[PDB]
Design a protein around this ligand. Structure first.
Ligand code: 43X
Ligand code: MN
Ligand code: NA
Ligand code: NA
Ligand code: NA
Ligand code: NA
Length: 296
DNA sequence: GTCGG
DNA sequence: GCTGATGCGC
DNA sequence: CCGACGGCGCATCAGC
């Protein structure tokens, strides 16, 4: 809301550091700064005022000054008009195209999605899938669809083996009314940290079998990443294709896993598996609290 | 780019 | 053919 | 001044 022009500017500069300059620590400096300014409850009137906040320093303060005087940054204006840099930044929006792959393409004169379409042969598997669903992957998912998606996953996991346990984590578990993707945690009593069968593959295969899963970006023994889609009517309009992650965790580390991927971000910082220690037994998420998703 | 040893 | 490094997403 | 700044699974590349 307040400082939005400032926060948009910073997030834009951040994206240029990451995607074009390949300077990841500066990308995080701009994001840290964008985040503290976003939570600052006043409208900022000067650089010096901003500078007081942790993560805002001399250079960001002078930039805030230029923006406040002119509504612009010479530097950002210039790079947006720049064909190379601007194209590199844009292509990274395609899932599977990082900063390195974006620069090689634009060096060969491949600058748009149309150019990408004409050169399928030059893309790897992840990248074709990302191109194909380019607009779908940017859409958010309504809760209502997430509940329908949840219904399909719990039903089908349970069909393969009733001893599986599955939990849809992320913001959704925290009760959020939209979500960026679907993250699912899976375990099975026979998979323990000190032990294993194709417990991921059988679940992925059942969901492909009923046409919930439509494509595969990556798939190993522990982690699957891919695309899914709700069924529609022949009459009604098609659902967008959605991202879905599935992680197989051992039973002991499960509730430690759930806790971690359920979050939120800020809440956790207050490990994933959990002066070297010795591994404590957990039958539930509350054993950890001992040693509620919604209010987070 | 910002922080802090 | 194998291992170790890098790119990528999150 | 000058180094830290996050870790991990999977796909794919570089190198032997
Ligand atoms: P995605 O569904 O965006 O995020 C869920 C989990 O959060 C963890 N996470 C996210 C992230 F963006 C970064 N950089 N690190 C990280 O550990 C793991 S996936
Ligand atoms: Mn997610
Ligand atoms: Na500051
Ligand atoms: Na990308
Ligand atoms: Na780049
Ligand atoms: Na995810």
């Amino acid at each position: 809301t307040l400082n939005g022009g400032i926060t948009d500017m910073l997030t834009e500069l951040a994206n240029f550091e990451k995607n074009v300059s390949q300077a990841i620590h500066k990308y995080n400096a701009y994001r840290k700064a964008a985040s503290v300014i976003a939570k600052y409850p006043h409208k900022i009137k000067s650089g010096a005022e901003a500078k007081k906040l942790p993560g805002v320093g001399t250079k960001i303060a002078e930039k805030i000054d230029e923006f406040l005087a002119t509504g612009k940054l010479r530097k950002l204006e210039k790079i947006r008009q720049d064909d190379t840099s601007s194209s590199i930044n844009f292509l990274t929006r395609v899932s599977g195209i990082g900063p390195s792959a974006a620069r090689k393409f634009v060096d060969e004169g491949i600058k748009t999605l149309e150019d990408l379409r004409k050169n399928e042969d030059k893309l790897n598997h992840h990248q074709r899938i990302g191109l194909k669903y380019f607009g779908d992957f940017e859409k958010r998912i309504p809760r209502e669809e997430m509940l329908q998606m949840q219904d399909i996953v719990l039903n089908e996991v349970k069909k393969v083996d009733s001893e599986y346990i599955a939990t849809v984590c992320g913001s959704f578990r925290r009760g959020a009314e939209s979500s960026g993707d679907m993250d699912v945690l899976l375990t099975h009593p026979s998979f323990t940290s000190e032990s294993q069968p194709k417990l991921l593959h059988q679940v992925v295969e059942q969901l492909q079998k009923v046409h919930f899963i439509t494509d595969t970006l990556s798939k190993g023994e522990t982690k699957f990443m891919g695309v899914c889609q709700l069924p529609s009517k022949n009459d009604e309009k098609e659902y967008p294709h959605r991202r879905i992650d599935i992680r197989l965790i051992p039973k002991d580390q499960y509730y430690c896993g759930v806790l971690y991927f359920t979050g939120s971000d800020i809440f956790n910082k207050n490990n994933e598996y959990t002066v070297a220690g010795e591994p404590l037994p957990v039958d539930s998420e509350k054993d950890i609290f001992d040693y509620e998703p919604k209010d987070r």
